[PDB]
Design a protein around this ligand. Structure first.
Ligand SMILES: COc1cc2[se]c(C(=O)CCC(=O)O)cc2cc1OCCCOc1cc2cc(C(=O)CCC(=O)O)[se]c2cc1OC
Lengths: 177, 177
């Protein structure tokens, strides 16, 4: 599968290097800036493989601040910085949650291969495989340990579903556990 | 192929976003720091799929400075910084060249899938496919325009081949053209 290898390498290429030190960067911010970060990387997995080159497309999901940068030497890039963004989530207009939110960038490729002049059905199937594979990796992975959540979703249409309520729901079971 | 999709997404995920503005960042450095950058991203493609989590493994390939950082909003990461490193290349002990050098990170996954308890033969075949595919993309790509070189190589052994001479050779045809 293309999606099988896109999921492995997203783990070996990004997650296995940022998740180990993610929660420590979160504590650093939460000390110097109940409206706090959920100590976990919430990966938006748009099943439509629609990832933006710009999360504000769904209101109530608003950017707040950037997480302290992690610099690590990688593949010849000295102090390769790993940047991550913290977003506020709003319910009824008020801040009901703050978390580190970002799209799975590999799903973007499944899109370009299906955006037409693969099939839109193959995209759904392989996006699902990517989610199912990456979730199985992150289950057996030793670096993924109460630090990552895979938010798979599919807005049937723009005038439709509230990701804010979808991600906030995950934020509540966090606090409940 | 896994390597077919690893090459596409390395393009759609990194190259197509950094190569457009790469040469401009190079001019900025070359103005404020004949021993200058070759205006192109030289991607080391270790056919052994051996990419380091640390290029100084081969002497005469030495780090000099970091390229001015490119900040761009990507997949929810605000000001996602794209960092790239400039390396000096030495011949007979003197600086014969300076260039932006970095390993292809996707080859690292082909390694973990072949590092054993895939096959080491499948790794060579798929590393080759990754190189051949990524070179065909970067040929038809509009963002890859006298800005990228794919340095495929295979050191038969440690006590062996000088990448310095291999990359410098590419640096000379640059100056010769
Ligand atoms: C190596 O395999 C991955 C490696 C990585 Se790194 C990374 C992020 O940082 C998240 C934000 C972003 O993607 O920009 C995602 C990711 C996803 C991966 O998927 C497997 C398919 C390979 O194709 C991709 C290659 C790259 C390489 C990038 C770099 O920077 C060079 C240095 C380095 O790899 O560290 Se980015 C990228 C996105 C690719 O396909 C989406």
């Amino acid at each position: 599968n293309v999606a099988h290898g896109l999921a492995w390498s997203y783990y070996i290429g990004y997650l296995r290097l940022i998740l180990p030190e993610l929660q420590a960067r979160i504590r650093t911010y939460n000390q110097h800036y109940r409206g706090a970060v959920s100590q976990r990387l919430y990966i938006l997995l748009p099943l439509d493989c629609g990832v933006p080159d710009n999360s504000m497309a769904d209101p109530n999901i608003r950017f707040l601040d950037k997480l302290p940068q992690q610099t690590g030497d990688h593949a010849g890039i000295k102090d390769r910085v790993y940047s991550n963004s913290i977003y506020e989530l709003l319910e009824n207009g008020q801040r009901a949650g703050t978390c580190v939110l970002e799209y799975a960038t590999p799903l973007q490729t499944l899109f370009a291969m299906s955006q037409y002049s693969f099939s839109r059905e193959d995209r759904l199937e392989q996006a699902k495989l990517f989610c199912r594979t990456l979730e199985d990796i992150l289950a057996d992975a030793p670096e993924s340990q109460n630090n990552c959540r895979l938010i798979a979703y599919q807005e049937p249409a723009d005038d439709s579903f509230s990701l804010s309520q979808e991600v906030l729901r995950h934020l509540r079971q966090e606090e409940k556990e």
